[PDB]
Amino acid sequence: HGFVSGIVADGKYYGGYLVNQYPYMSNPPDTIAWSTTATDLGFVDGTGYQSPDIICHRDAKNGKLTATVAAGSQIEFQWTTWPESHHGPVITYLAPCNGDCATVDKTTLKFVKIAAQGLIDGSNPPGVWASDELIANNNTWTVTIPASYAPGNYVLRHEIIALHSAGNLNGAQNYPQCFNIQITGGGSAQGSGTAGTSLYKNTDPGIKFDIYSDLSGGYPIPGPALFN
Numbered sequence: 001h002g003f004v005s006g007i008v009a010d011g012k013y014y015g016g017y018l019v020n021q022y023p024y025m026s027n028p029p030d031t032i033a034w035s036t037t038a039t040d041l042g043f044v045d046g047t048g049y050q051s052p053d054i055i056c057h058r059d060a061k062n063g064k065l066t067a068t069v070a071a072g073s074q075i076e077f078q079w080t081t082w083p084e085s086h087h088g089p090v091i092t093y094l095a096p097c098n099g100d101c102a103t104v105d106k107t108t109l110k111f112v113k114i115a116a117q118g119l120i121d122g123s124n125p126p127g128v129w130a131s132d133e134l135i136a137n138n139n140t141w142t143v144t145i146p147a148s149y150a151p152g153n154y155v156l157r158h159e160i161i162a163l164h165s166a167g168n169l170n171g172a173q174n175y176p177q178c179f180n181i182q183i184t185g186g187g188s189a190q191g192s193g194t195a196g197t198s199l200y201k202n203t204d205p206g207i208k209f210d211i212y213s214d215l216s217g218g219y220p221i222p223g224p225a226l227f228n
């Protein structure tokens with residue numbers, strides 16, 4: 001349970017979507033972040049993986065602003081305090097808007113996985129995960145925008161998947177947060193993306209997963225192939 005309160009992109013701070021304030025307003029401030037109705041600081045579980053809610057979280061609507069970021073530079077996501085119990089991977093995606101992200105139809109986005117970390121040390125279950133590294137780093141996560149990525153407008157989809165109840169079907173808890181970015185000073189590369197409602201299934205090996213038993217088999221990070 002948590003959300004992203006802001007990001008630092010190319011050394012500049014951008015306020016996020018303040019989900020405990022902005023839904024409770026007629027005319028909330030413009031942000032690079034997408035709006036959601038996830039006011040419980042909750043999640044999308046396997047019941048919603050083929051619902052448009054999985055794309056940018058519950059009932060999400062376009063952010064009206066866009067942040068610039070140099071290809072090869074870093075984005076830092078600032079989360080509200082993440083529970084240690086909520087062990088799981090941290091995954092980051094880019095989907096091209098092919099024009100202004102403020103007016104892209106979210107159902108048309110095709111996401112490329114540009115970063116992902118999963119199980120760090122499973123020797124003593126439930127083990128140490130990306131989420132735990134996030135906690136250790138002042139509840140922040142940093143990703144590099146590939147220097148080779150083509151300049152353009154993209155939806156940046158950053159997600160924690162908490163696996164503390166993932167042994168049950170539809171038990172994993174997805175926490176996506178979306179942001180509009182413009183990659184500058186890029187190369188020519190772009191991945192082949194996967195629709196938001198095709199990213200995950202409730203029987204995927206990294207989704208229906210028991211963190212509390214022997215982890216000698218590791219952890220297969222879910223979602224489509226990492227861009228190289």
Ligand SMILES: [Cu+2]
Nearest residue numbers: 001002083086
């Ligand atoms: Cu929670």
